[PDB]
Design a protein around this ligand. Structure first.
Ligand SMILES: Nc1ncnc2n[nH]cc12
Ligand SMILES: [Cl-]
Length: 260
């Protein structure tokens, strides 16, 4: 079994493009963490990770270089991902969706407030701790959009097509924050309907045209109660300057609705 200084690498938690994530257990102390193994722009990622200090963001513990392999030591989320709590075609109980949405907003407000954009919010990147607390994970596409109190526009296209905002397909440069707000709306849809609304938010996508023409008698919208659906009408707005901001999400009727 492989090992790094005092830690054993006991099991795989993620095996993707950007290396593997392992469960690491300190042989002496029994402390369990997560370790990302990169087989060597990760200087950027580490710099962003060291900024992160919030209950709804995965904490960074530190790193070790050993030849051409870096080890990123991060808070373990033993509960798996939001992806695993979504029943296909069903979603999850509205009160659980609302609580996860509250936590996702707390995390995103935090990141925006230190001028960080995640750029790939989706259920695989939203991990759960042992008490089902949501943690925003995977900062490999994250970037700075505000420095010295000056906003910079993004122009790199990235993320995951079903989750990306339409401006990212249509504009040369765009604001970072409304792109993360949009992806949070697609996550809320997935939680309440167990179904993604469209392959991509382009005029060539029939399901996306249906939404802009307000055909909410179709799936996934006909599975969603009128209150959360009124919030999705304010989030999934094609013009990013008319899209609801997080301050205004926090004033929404469903957002503030007491639930089971
Ligand atoms: N993929 C992952 N699984 C569990 N905990 C983690 N923390 N950072 C990434 C993780
Ligand atoms: Cl889904």
């Amino acid at each position: 079994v492989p090992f790094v200084e005092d830690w054993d690498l006991v099991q795989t938690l993620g095996e993707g493009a950007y290396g593997e994530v392992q469960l690491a257990v300190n042989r002496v102390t029994e402390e369990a963490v997560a370790v990302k193994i990169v087989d060597m722009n990760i200087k950027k990622e580490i710099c962003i990770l060291k900024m992160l200090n919030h209950e709804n963001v995965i904490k960074f513990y530190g790193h070790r270089r050993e030849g051409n392999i870096q080890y990123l030591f991060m808070e373990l989320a033993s509960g798996g991902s939001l992806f695993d709590r979504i029943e296909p075609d069903i979603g999850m109980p509205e009160p659980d969706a609302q609580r996860f949405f509250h936590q996702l907003m707390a995390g995103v407000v935090y990141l925006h407030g230190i001028g960080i954009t995640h750029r790939d919010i989706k259920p695989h990147n939203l991990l759960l701790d042992e008490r089902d607390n949501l943690k925003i994970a995977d900062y490999s596409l994250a970037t700075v959009f505000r420095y010295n109190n000056r906003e910079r526009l993004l122009n790199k296209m990235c993320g995951t097509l079903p989750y990306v905002a339409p401006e990212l397909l249509k504009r040369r440069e765009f604001h970072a924050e409304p792109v993360d707000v949009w992806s949070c709306g697609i996550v809320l849809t997935a939680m309440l309907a167990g179904e993604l609304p469209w392959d991509q938010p382009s005029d060539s996508c029939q399901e996306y045209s249906d939404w802009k023409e307000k055909k909410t008698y179709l799936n996934p919208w006909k599975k969603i109660d009128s209150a959360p659906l009124a919030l999705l009408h304010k989030i999934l707005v094609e013009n990013p300057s008319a899209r609801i901001t997080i301050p205004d999400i926090k004033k929404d009727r469903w957002y503030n609705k007491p639930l089971k």
